[PDB]
């Protein structure tokens, strides 16, 4: 398959075997039958023709990979030469994290139709995974402003353990 099953976990489909008892003919079976030899097969014959043509002259393309670069928490103050790599790397991880939330959202939406009337309890795992990701996403990038920058992201984060450690001191008592 083109995509990955681990990224998009699909529970096995439980399709019942057809076992009718009424003597009169079941029409739907016939509609699928006359669809098969009128639409499905001619589509397949054209498809197998394009696929063999595609494999006749196959050209390749790869996926661009960016190596790790020093980010903004160790980049020297001012020194925008180091800030550039820091900012670009952080913004790249922003898009990746946005896609990560997207991947979870489709999985959560996929459960809805997949589980039908069982959606409420069957995929509570999907709900908590999104809840865990969404909460963590909020601590990462939420309320960064329309002019968000890695400096602000570090600034917002640095407040988080500031309050957390202050709470830790209070909790220790």
């Amino acid at each position: 398959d083109s995509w990955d099953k681990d990224v998009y976990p699909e529970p096995p489909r439980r399709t019942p075997a057809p076992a009718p008892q009424t003597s009169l003919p079941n029409p739907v079976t016939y509609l699928t039958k006359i669809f098969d030899l009128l639409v499905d097969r001619p589509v397949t014959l054209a498809r197998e023709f394009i696929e063999q043509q595609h494999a006749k002259n196959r050209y390749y393309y790869y996926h661009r990979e960016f190596r790790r670069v020093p980010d903004i928490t160790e980049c020297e103050e001012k020194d925008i030469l180091c800030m550039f790599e820091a900012e670009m790397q952080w913004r790249r991880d922003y898009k990746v994290d946005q896609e990560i939330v997207n991947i979870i959202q489709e999985r959560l939406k996929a459960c809805q139709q997949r589980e039908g009337e069982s959606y409420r309890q069957n995929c509570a795992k999907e709900l908590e995974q999104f809840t865990q990701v969404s909460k963590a996403f909020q601590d990462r990038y939420s309320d960064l402003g329309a002019h968000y920058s890695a400096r602000k992201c570090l600034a917002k984060q640095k407040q988080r353990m500031l309050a957390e450690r202050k709470a830790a001191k209070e909790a220790a008592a």
């Binding site: 083109s2 995509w3 990224v7 998009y8 096995p12 489909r13 439980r14 399709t15 019942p16 075997a17 076992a19 009128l38 639409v39 499905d40 001619p42 589509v43 054209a46 498809r47 489709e106 999985r107 939406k109 996929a110 139709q113 997949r114 589980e115 039908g116």
Partner: protein
């Protein structure tokens, strides 16, 4: 005849391209055509793995 060519150029070839679009582009991406699991009932077998799920337990005998 006027019904035939109308069927070919308005029913036949549209579902042709839609099927090709669905079977090899839309379904080529995950979670694009998501189904409801075919509901199964106690005592109905499923062909993918073969075994029948157990028959539902015998009723408390309610009759009208």
């Amino acid at each position: 005849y006027r019904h035939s060519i109308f069927a070919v150029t308005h029913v036949l070839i549209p579902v042709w391209i839609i099927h090709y679009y669905l079977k090899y582009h839309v379904t080529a991406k995950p979670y694009t055509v998501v189904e409801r699991k075919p509901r199964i009932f106690p005592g109905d077998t499923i062909l993918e793995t073969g075994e029948v799920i157990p028959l539902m337990k015998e009723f408390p005998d309610q009759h009208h």
